[model samples]
Target: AQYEDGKQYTTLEKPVAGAPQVLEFFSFFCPHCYQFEEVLHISDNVKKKLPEGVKMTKYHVNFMGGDLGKDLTQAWAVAMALGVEDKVTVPLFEGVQKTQTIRSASDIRDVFINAGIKGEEYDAAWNSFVVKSLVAQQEKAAADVQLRGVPAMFVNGKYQLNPQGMDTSNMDVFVQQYADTVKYLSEK
Candidate 1:
């Protein structure tokens, strides 16, 4: 859906420090998210189209709240902590969706290990307070934004727009329009 002021995406009552915090509220297990990336290559496209100084942060939403659910969530936090997010993100999604082999910290650790991260280093990141805090921070951000579902985009941390009326089966146009809107909002 398109932005409708406070109706669609709520603006911060007080200004948040990050004025142009553009976030993608997502879960690694979200099939639609994976499909959009697979079919239309949204992430790479979005990166190329990002506005000046507008770095898009992918926040791993921890809403599912279960053993396996927390696995993917913590896995992402751990990857972010270990500075290997770019290496492990798509693999994590692939491991889960395509291979059906990602279900535990060990599975996630193996992915990192194969990505050249030492087992000890992966363990440190996997079990660190940083991962816990990061996951908690994401949980809070998700709650603060009142995120309804995965793969939703919030521009400037105020306007929440989705491919509500668009055919999201392919996301090229959806993502491009989002980048255009991001440029508009960043300039506005």
Candidate 2:
């Protein structure tokens, strides 16, 4: 549904300009998203074993934004503007995963800022056109996509897996199901 077109991703009938993207819709507060984080890392490692055209893009779900709901939304939206997603995304996920304490907003910012983004720079990017457009894009995603929780995974906008679909009673089953979805996507 979205594509990284020059500085910003545009919604056109055309697919994304680069490789087919493997996407994850996740949030900081979601424990399931955290659970899948390690699997994502493992998936990425495994994904690399394939050809180079396949790539990953993670959209951090801001549905649970705290006092700075819009602020948090803009902060992440800015990453697209600053074009530093490649640098900071993994670390931010790590910080979120390590946080035993749930819903730590400051902790997320620290990891992002430490990775070369400053307080003010982050502020500016959050308000940029691309960032703003990206935020706008999510509105459509929320309205149309049957998304119930964070860490919903999508492969090339066709194949998808949600933690809820797998037997959450067994996280191992959930993880394997997720990997199976990856397997299907890989074949495509």
Candidate 3:
């Protein structure tokens, strides 16, 4: 299948690093983002099909949670700092959007606590320079893309996927086409 610029994907104004990279801009507060992860499992499936040495990285966007946006982003960074993203991403999504159990920083901390991450450990990463820097970078990247929505996927820091151009009615076809586009863009 042929993927064309502006149709299947749109090139960024200022591309980041030249390496083959897949970046997802998402927010825990966005229901669609939650569904994208929980229902479609887009990230997981795409990660499996990515070329060797190519990995998908997610950037928690700060435009959805309102006042809690930055805090939610920090929570994600902390999960990454402790190498517990796989353990916390879905729970965070469920707590924030699905179950509405997480509304503040303290509640967010409890999610980590429940995951076996000690309070001190979560606190350390929460206040660490690395996690703070990561949150800042994520905020900057979101701003750089002029992002106005969640669950946005970009390949090689250049090609942004155009969902409207894909077959969204069928999950199987959509996943294949989406992954294929990422593979195609990365190889370019």
Q: Point to the candidate with the largest TM-score.
A: 3
Query: What clash pairs does model 1 have?
Result: none
Q: Against the unseen true structure, what C-alpha lDDT does each candidate score?
A: 0.70, 0.56, 0.84
RMSD of each: 3.2, 8.5, 1.7
Candidate 1 Cα errors over 4 Å, as ranges: 1-20, 167-171
Kindly list the per-residue Cα lDDT of model 3 for residues 1-188, writing each as its tens digit.
Answer: 47788887889878767533788988888877887788888887788888676777888987776878889899889987789998898888888877889989999999999989999899999999999898888887777778898779988777898877888788888878887887788778
- Superposed Cα deviation of residue 97, candidate 1 (Å): 1.0
List candidate 3 segments past 4 Å from native.
17-20
The list of candidate 2 runs beyond 4 A from truth reads 1-21, 38-43, 65-70, 86-110, 162-177, 186-188
The best candidate in terms of lDDT: 3
Write the candidate numbers in order of decreasing lDDT: 3, 1, 2
| lDDT tens readout by residue for model 1, 42-147 | 6567667665666777777766535776777787888778778788877877987899888776887788888999988877777899889988887777777666
Ten contiguous residues with the weakest lDDT in model 3:
13-22
Candidate rank order under TM-score: 3, 1, 2
CA shift of 176, model 3, Å: 1.2
Q: Is candidate 2 or candidate 3 better by TM-score?
A: 3
Overall local distance difference test of candidate 2: 0.56
Candidate 2 residue lDDT tens string, 3-85: 12221111234333332356667665566555555544535543655467767665666566454444445556667677886
